[PDB]
Amino acid sequence: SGALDVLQMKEEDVLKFLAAGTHLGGTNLDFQMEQYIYKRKSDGIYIINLKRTWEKLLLAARAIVAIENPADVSVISSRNTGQRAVLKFAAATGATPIAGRFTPGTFTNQIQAAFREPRLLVVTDPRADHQPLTEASYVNLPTIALCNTDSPLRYVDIAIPCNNKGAHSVGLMWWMLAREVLRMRGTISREHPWEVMPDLYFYRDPEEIEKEEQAA
Amino acid sequence: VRMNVLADALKSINNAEKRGKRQVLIRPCSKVIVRFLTVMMKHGYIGEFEIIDDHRAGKIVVNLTGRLNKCGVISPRFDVQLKDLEKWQNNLLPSRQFGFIVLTTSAGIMDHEEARRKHTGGKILGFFF
Amino acid sequence: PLAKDLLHPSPEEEKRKHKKKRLVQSPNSYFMDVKCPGCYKITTVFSHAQTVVLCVGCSTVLCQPTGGKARLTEGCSFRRKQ
Amino acid sequence: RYTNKYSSQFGGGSQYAYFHEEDESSFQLVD
Amino acid sequence: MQNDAGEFVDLYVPRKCSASNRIIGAKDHASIQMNVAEVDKVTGRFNGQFKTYAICGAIRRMGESDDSILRLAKADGIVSKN
Amino acid sequence: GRMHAPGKGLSQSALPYRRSVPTWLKLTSDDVKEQIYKLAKKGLTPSQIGVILRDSHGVAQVRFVTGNKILRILKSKGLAPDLPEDLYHLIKKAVAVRKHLERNRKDKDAKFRLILIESRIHRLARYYKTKRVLPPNWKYESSTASALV
């Protein structure tokens, strides 16, 4: 971002984006996501441009560090592949997590016990999580969304282009968001690698934890 | 078929302004529309524009900052004498403080307050406010 | 969209559109010269020609009228002029 | 080196010579 | 607004959109005001100064808030020029 | 859309911006005019002369190289057809439809197509009498079908 060379992409970040499958989008295109695709392959997959992913991710990290209080940035994940990344990001940065089922009224019903009033909203996937995206329209929330190529851009303000479908690329995108916020705010220096692996943010399947528990 | 080209141009401006778009493309291009959009530009309502020259009747690409609530046409062009100008600016305009009626007079195409200051009347073309 | 520039269109979206719907309309035909391989008349054909263009050495046909582009006879050689 | 054995030294004429005006690779061939 | 003694007689002056310049009313409950933080050019850390953009809710409802945030951040030196 | 059909189709030939004779076009104005004369001696209308010079001689637009049009060139030599071309083809199609309809009187739709073609003939004749290309006593009468052409 910023036309600055300290904030540019390095080859280590690009090897993570290549190895996770962030650049492999979907097979359909919502018509205002086509400023992010490079080209469509013979397979039918659209390729997400990674520089647009990086500049929208750094603009999202600028929007996340711009709140003085870290406790009223709230992160939503309803699908199962982003719950552990939301809980790890919320333990890392000090945000508030909402993982799992999002009971409606938690931004507009004042007398229910889970009534919050955050100042920004980061969601996992803007089609499956459209219930807090619609409930952001009565409370004046700007909304940041990790967006696939086939995902509707109603009521989101900052769309971070990725493959939000797989486990690896969701866990990586929440990891890169945590890393850019903690470097920008001042916690980690820019020159060392961050000591937290992205495998702390990945999804652990019940079949995957049972194959890890029975060792050879 | 297509009659009264200025009307269909101003309906193009209005439909693409109500959606908050930033640039329109007007076709055809009269010399009526270039003086009309000169009048709306000089009051600070649309900003710059371009007259695209093919060797047929050209196109016009207008910049838009939305400042423009309504841009309309009056068809047919009724003869407005100088005593009928207050009856016409009471009908079409939203206020005594703003809004303009463009009318085509023998000193040129001009708005309705300049036609009182130049002491002339003529046929009406439309309005913008 | 909705910030979209109409005064500077890209050539991908200027070869995309219909020939009447560009900023300046411009035809999608071109002028060829057909070389017949056993004679030395360079012969000038339209791309979309509607008559059978007869050459004057060995009186052969160069091109066939079809609904679109004229299918040149197979084994001649062509290039676009200009 | 080899082509410098085959030129003439005073004998130059091109009256038996054929100048091609369309010698090019610019033509495509139609299938 | 302003009467002949020079007084400003209005109750308040409402915000306007950064994307469409429509008046964000009192009850446009879907409109946002978003801060986007600046960084220092030598270290890449947040130094306290802001960029502020406001979008009315009617632009947000049709899916056009993202592209206008991208254009407004591009023109004030946050997004690169590629 | 079209005049006597419900169709709204858009199919035209769109002339380019650049109005100039090209660098390879070696036919001068006088050579193009003599090509037009020896092509119009074979019985040809303006349209077929325009087709032949487009296809086989490489002049795209004849009024771009000479400076004036094909029918001005044919009328300045007395080779102009006496009826115009379009009115000739509409009259010839009307004689063809009436020659079909003298045998088949259960042909309820070709009678209707005769009504449309004769309407287009009267619209062109009423245009041409106001540009004085025709005499003002020109009446198209259905007895006078094979007396015209």
Q: What is the CA radius of gyration of chain A?
A: 17
Nearest to C31 among F14, F51, F58 (CB): F58
SS (HEC) of E45-77: CEEEEEEEEEECHHHHHCCCHHHHHHHHHHHCC
Closest chain B residue to the Cα of E60, Cα to Cα: B20
Answer yes or no: do E20 and B66 touch at CB < 8 A. yes
CA distance E21 to B21: 11
* Interchain pair F19, B55: CB under 8 A: yes
Backbone φ and ψ for A156, nearest 5 degrees, come out as -105, 150
Task: Assign B23 to helix, strand or coil.
Answer: strand
- Which of E3, E17, E20 would you mutate first to test chain B, the one with the most B CBs within 10 A? E20
Evaluate the omega torsion of the peptide bond into residue B28 and state whether it is cis, within 30 degrees of 0.
yes
Return the CA Rg of chain B: 14
Which H or E run contains A147?
Answer: strand A143-147
Contact criterion met (CB < 8 Å) for F55 and C51: yes
The response to whether C63 counts as a known ligand-binding position is no
Q: Is C55 annotated as a binding residue?
A: yes
- Tell me the two tokens of residue B75: 């068809």
Size of interface C-E (CB pairs under 8 A): 7
Q: Is E75 exposed, middle or buried (0-12, 13-18, 19+ CB in 10 A)?
A: exposed
Q: How distant is the Cα of B54 from the closest Cα of chain F, in angstroms?
A: 7
CA distance C5 to chain B (A): 7
Q: Chains A and E: how many Cβ contacts under 8 Å? A: 104
- Provide the token pair at F115: 């009504």
C-alpha A184/C-alpha A155 separation (Å) is: 27
| DSSP code of residue B38 | H
Based on the structure, what is the number of domains in chain C? 1
**DSSP class per residue in B62-126:** EE--S--S-EEE-SS--EE-GGGHHHHHHHS-S-SSS-EEEEEETTEEEEHHHHHHTT--EEEEE
* Chain E contact set for A153 (CB, 8 A): 63, 66
Rounded Cα distance, A199 and A12, in Å:
16
Upstream peptide bond of B76 is cis (omega within 30 degrees of 0): yes
Chains interfacing with C (3 or more CB pairs < 8 Å): B, D, E, F
The structure tokens listed for A128 are: 């499956």
- Give the strand pairing for A143-147 and A120-123: parallel
With beta carbons less than 8 A apart as the criterion, state whether F143 and F94 touch. no
If you classify domain B1-68 with CATH, what class do you get? alpha beta
Quote the CA–CA distance of F127 and F130 in Å, as a whole number: 6
Cα–Cα distance for residue pair A186/C63, rounded to 1 Å = 73
| Among B18, B22, B56, the residue to mutate for chain C (most C Cβ within 10 A) | B22
A157 interfaces chain E, CB cutoff of 8 Å: yes
* Torsion, CA A111, CA A112, CA A117, CA A122, rounded to 10: -160
Q: Which residue has the tokens 């858009």?
A: F10
Chains A and E touch (3+ CB pairs under 8 A): yes
Annotated binding-site residue? C58: yes
Q: Which experimental approach was used here?
A: cryo-EM
Helices and strands, number each (H, E), in chain D: 0, 1
**How distant is the alpha carbon of residue E24 from its chain centre?**
11
Q: Are F13 and F61 in contact (CB under 8 A)?
A: no
CA-nearest of E12, E14, E56, E13 to E33 is E56
* Closest by Cα among F16, F90, F29 to F63: F29
The DSSP secondary structure of C37-69, one letter per residue, reads: TTS--EEEEESS--S--B-SSTT-B-EE--SSS
Residues 6 or more apart whose Cβ sits within 8 Å of residue B44: B67
Identify the CA nearest to E19 among candidates A138, A59, C2: C2
CATH code, B69-129: 3.30.1490.10
**CA separation, residue E36 to residues A60, A156, A158, B69, E42 (Å):** 8, 15, 11, 31, 19
Q: Are A157 and E63 in contact (CB under 8 A)?
A: no
Using a CB-CB cut-off of 8 Å, the residues of chain E touching A142 are: 32, 34
> Domain of C46?
1-82
Q: Distance from C4 to chain E by nearest Cα, in Å?
A: 11
Instruction: Let me know if E55 is exposed, middle or buried by CB neighbors in 10 A (0-12, 13-18, 19+).
Output: buried
Q: Mention every residue, 6+ apart, whose C-beta is less than 8 A from residue A100.
A: A77, A78, A83
Contact E31 A140 (CB under 8 A): yes
Domain boundaries, chain F: 26-80, 81-149
How close does chain B come to C51, measured CA to CA in Å?
30
How many beta carbons lie within 10 A of that of residue A114, not counting itself? 11
Token couple for F106? 């259960």
Tokens of D25: 């690779």
Which residues, including other chains, have CB under 8 Å from residue E70's CB and lie 6 or more apart? A56, E79
Q: Which other chains touch chain F, taking contact as 3+ CB pairs less than 8 Å apart?
A: B, C
Tell if the CB–CB gap between B66 and E22 is shorter than 8 Å: yes
C-alpha closest to that of F54 among C30, B127, B36? C30
Q: Which two tokens stand for residue F18?
A: 């650049």
**C10: domain CATH number?**
2.20.25.100
Q: Does F22 touch chain C (CB under 8 A)?
A: yes
Domain layout of chain B by residue ranges: 1-68, 69-129
Selecting from C3, C23, C24 the residue whose C-beta is nearest the C-beta of B22 gives C3
The CA-atom distances, in angstroms, between B27 and each of A24, B13, B30, B98, B124 are 42, 11, 9, 29, 22
E19: distance to nearest CA of chain C, Å? 9
8 Å CB contact of E71 and C2: no
Backbone Cα Rg of chain D: 16
Put simply, whether C73 touches D (Cβ < 8 Å) is: yes
Q: Between B and C, how many residue pairs show a Cβ–Cβ distance under 8 A?
A: 24
